[PDB]
C-alpha cells in the first residue's frame, strides 16, 4: 500500500562546529560521526589528492593553513565590500577574492587554483552531516531542517537553502537557532498563555542573546543582542598568555615565536579549559615544548576564573540590553536556556543565575547539541501527512 518513509534529520550548521540529530521512537538521537564525535568541525581542506571534511580537515590545519577553509558562515549571503567581511579577512589564512562584489574562497586543489562560493563550502559540510546520518540509519536521507542565527536576513537564508540543494537535501524549512533551542525543551508545548524565553548562546567566537515570546506554539523574536568579539577562543587566549609568562619566569625563555610550541600550548590550554568545567584543577603536561624543555604544570579553576573574569562579566551587558529592547524586566522571563559548549563553564552559569535571582537554567540537553535537537524535533513534525478521521 504505502512504503515506510525515511526519517527526516535536523542539522545545526554552525560557524565552527555542526551537529545532526533524528527524532525516532518518541526521542531525539544526536548522531556521532565515524570518529565517535557528536559534533563535527565546519572545516573543509583541499590537497593535491583529496578533499577532507570535518575532523580530517581540522586535524591537518597546522601545516595546510592556506587550503583549509573554516568560518564560511561569516561570509554566506554577504557582499565582498561589507565592513564585516573586510575586517574578518585579516584574521583568515586562506584567500578571499572579489567576484562581482561576492566573496569567494580561493585554494589549491587537485593541481589547480579553484575558487568556491561560501554556499558551496557549506554544501560540503552538509554532505558530511547527511552521510553521518545515513551511516546510523542505514538508508539514504533526503529531508532536513537547517538552522540559522535569528539576525540572518533573506539573502543569508536563501544562500543557506542553496547550500542544502547543492548537497542533495530537500530543505523542509530554515528555522532560527534560538527557536530550535526552545523547541528542544518543548517550550512551545506548554499550552495557552504567553511565555517569555531568553536563549543565552556563548560560542567559540561569538555571543548571542535572544528573547522570544511563545503564545499557543507561535514564536515571536522580541529582541536580539550580543558581542561579536566574545567566545571560547578568548578564554583560550587568556590561558595561552598566562602559560607563556609562566615559562618565561620558570625557564627564562620566550616561546611566543615558535608557532609549533604556541600551537601545542593552545591545544593543551583548550583541553585544560574543558577539564576545569568538571574538576577544581587541571594538569598541563607537554614534552619538549621549547629547547627540549618539558612543560609540566597545573592551573586551578579559581586562577582560570580570575584570568577570564572581565570576559565572563561582560556577557551580562547584552542580557540587560536585550531586556530593555524587549521592554521586559528580569522577573518577567519564564525560562532561561543555555546554548554553546562555553556555557558549561561553572562561573558563567553562576553569574547568569545570580543575575536572574537564583532561577534554574535549562542545561539538561547538552548545550552544544540543543539546536540540532530542536531542528530534529521540527523535521519529524514537518513530514507528517496524517488524514483526519470522520
Ligand atoms: N565542557 C566545556 N567547558 C568549557 N568550554 C567548552 C566545553 N566544551 C566545549 Br565545546 N567548550 C568550548 O566551546 C567552544 C565551542 O566552539 C570551544 O571554544 C570549546 O573550547
Ligand atoms: Mg550555535
UniProtKB/Swiss-Prot annotation:
Q: Which organism is it from?
A: Homo sapiens (Human)
Q: Please list where the region (Nucleotide-binding domain (NBD)) is annotated.
A: 4-382
Q: What induces it?
A: By heat shock.
Concerning PTM, the database record says:
In response to cellular stress, acetylated at Lys-79 by NA110 and then gradually deacetylated by HDAC4 at later stages. Acetylation enhances its chaperone activity and also determines whether it will function as a chaperone for protein refolding or degradation by controlling its binding to co-chaperones HOPX and STUB1. The acetylated form and the non-acetylated form bind to HOPX and STUB1 respectively. Acetylation also protects cells against various types of cellular stress.
GO cellular component terms given for this protein: aggresome; blood microparticle; centriole; centrosome; cytoplasm; cytosol; endoplasmic reticulum; extracellular exosome
**ATP-binding found in the keyword field:** yes
Signal peptide residues on this chain, from the entry's feature table: none
Q: Which gene encodes it?
A: HSPA1A
Role of this protein: Molecular chaperone implicated in a wide variety of cellular processes, including protection of the proteome from stress, folding and transport of newly synthesized polypeptides, activation of proteolysis of misfolded proteins and the formation and dissociation of protein complexes. Plays a pivotal role in the protein quality control system, ensuring the correct folding of proteins, the re-folding of misfolded proteins and controlling the targeting of proteins for subsequent degradation. This is achieved through cycles of ATP binding, ATP hydrolysis and ADP release, mediated by co-chaperones. (Microbial infection) In case of rotavirus A infection, serves as a post-attachment receptor for the virus to facilitate entry into the cell.
Q: What is known of its domains?
A: The N-terminal nucleotide binding domain (NBD) (also known as the ATPase domain) is responsible for binding and hydrolyzing ATP. The C-terminal substrate-binding domain (SBD) (also known as peptide-binding domain) binds to the client/substrate proteins. The two domains are allosterically coupled so that, when ATP is bound to the NBD, the SBD binds relatively weakly to clients. When ADP is bound in the NBD, a conformational change enhances the affinity of the SBD for client proteins.
Q: Which UniProt keywords apply?
A: Acetylation, ATP-binding, Chaperone, Cytoplasm, Cytoskeleton, Host cell receptor for virus entry, Host-virus interaction, Methylation, Nucleotide-binding, Nucleus, Phosphoprotein, Receptor, Secreted, Stress response
Keyword flag Secreted: yes
Kindly list the positions at which N6-acetyllysine occurs in this protein: 79, 110, 248, 350
Sites of the modification N-acetylalanine? 4
Protein name, per record: Heat shock 70 kDa protein 1A
Query: Where does the UniProt entry say this protein principally localizes?
Result: cytoplasm
Share what the entry says about its subunit structure, partners included.
Component of the CatSper complex. Identified in a IGF2BP1-dependent mRNP granule complex containing untranslated mRNAs. Interacts with CHCHD3, DNAJC7, IRAK1BP1, PPP5C and TSC2. Interacts with TERT; the interaction occurs in the absence of the RNA component, TERC, and dissociates once the TERT complex has formed. Interacts with TRIM5 (via B30.2/SPRY domain). Interacts with METTL21A. Interacts with DNAAF2. Interacts with PRKN. Interacts with FOXP3. Interacts with NOD2; the interaction enhances NOD2 stability. Interacts with DNAJC9 (via J domain).
Molecular function per GO: ATP binding; ATP hydrolysis activity; ATP-dependent protein disaggregase activity; ATP-dependent protein folding chaperone; C3HC4-type RING finger domain binding; cadherin binding; death receptor agonist activity; denatured protein binding
Disease link? In certain aggressive cases of activated B cell-like diffuse large B-cell lymphoma (ABC-DLBCL), plays a role in the cytoplasmic sequestration of misfolded N-terminal mutated PRDM1 proteins, promotes their association with SYNV1/HRD1 and degradation through the SYNV1-proteasome pathway. HSPA1A inhibition restores PRDM1 nuclear localization and transcriptional activity in lymphoma cell lines and suppresses growth in xenografts.
Amino acid at each position: 500500500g504505502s512504503m515506510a518513509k525515511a526519517a527526516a534529520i535536523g542539522i545545526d550548521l554552525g560557524t565552527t562546529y555542526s551537529c545532526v540529530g533524528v527524532f525516532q521512537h518518541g526521542k531525539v538521537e544526536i548522531i556521532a560521526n565515524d570518529q565517535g564525535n557528536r559534533t563535527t568541525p565546519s572545516y573543509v581542506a583541499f590537497t593535491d589528492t583529496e578533499r577532507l571534511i570535518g575532523d580530517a580537515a581540522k586535524n591537518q590545519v597546522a601545516l595546510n593553513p592556506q587550503n583549509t577553509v573554516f568560518d564560511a558562515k561569516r561570509l554566506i549571503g554577504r557582499k565582498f565590500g561589507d565592513p564585516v567581511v573586510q575586517s574578518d579577512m585579516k584574521h583568515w589564512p586562506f584567500q578571499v577574492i572579489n567576484d562581482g562584489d561576492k566573496p569567494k574562497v580561493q585554494v589549491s586543489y587537485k593541481g589547480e587554483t579553484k575558487a568556491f562560493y561560501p554556499e558551496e563550502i557549506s554544501s560540503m559540510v552538509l554532505t558530511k552531516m547527511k552521510e553521518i546520518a545515513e551511516a546510523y540509519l542505514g538508508y539514504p536521507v533526503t529531508n532536513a531542517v537547517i538552522t540559522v542565527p535569528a539576525y540572518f536576513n533573506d539573502s543569508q537564508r536563501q544562500a543557506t537553502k542553496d547550500a542544502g540543494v547543492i548537497a542533495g537535501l530537500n530543505v523542509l524549512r530554515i528555522i532560527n537557532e534560538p527557536t530550535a533551542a526552545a523547541i528542544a525543551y518543548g517550550l512551545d508545548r506548554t499550552g495557552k498563555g504567553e511565555r517569555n524565553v531568553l536563549i543565552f548562546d556563548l560560542g567559540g567566537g561569538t555571543f548571542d542573546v535572544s528573547i522570544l515570546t511563545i503564545d499557543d506554539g507561535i514564536f515571536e523574536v522580541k529582541a536580539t543582542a550580543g558581542d561579536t568579539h566574545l567566545g571560547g577562543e578568548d578564554f583560550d587566549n587568556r590561558l595561552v598568555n598566562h602559560f607563556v609568562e609562566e615559562f618565561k619566569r620558570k625557564h627564562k625563555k620566550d616561546i611566543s615565536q615558535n608557532k609549533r610550541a604556541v600551537r601545542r600550548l593552545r591545544t593543551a590550554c583548550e583541553r585544560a579549559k574543558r577539564t576545569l568545567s568538571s574538576s577544581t584543577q587541571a594538569s598541563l603536561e607537554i614534552d619538549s615544548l621549547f629547547e627540549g624543555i618539558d612543560f609540566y604544570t597545573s592551573i586551578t579553576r579559581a586562577r582560570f576564573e580570575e584570568l577570564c573574569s572581565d570576559l565572563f562579566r561582560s556577557t551580562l551587558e547584552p542580557v540587560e540590553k536585550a531586556l530593555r529592547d524587549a521592554k521586559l524586566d528580569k522577573a518577567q522571563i519564564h525560562d532561561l536556556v543555555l546554548v554553546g559548549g562555553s556555557t558549561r563553564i561553572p562561573k558563567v552559569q553562576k553569574l547568569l543565575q545570580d543575575f536572574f535571582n537564583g532561577r534554574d537554567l535549562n542545561k539538561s540537553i547538552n548545550p552544544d547539541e540543543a539546536v540540532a535537537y530542536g531542528a530534529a524535533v521540527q523535521a519529524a513534525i514537518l513530514i507528517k501527512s496524517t488524514r483526519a478521521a470522520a
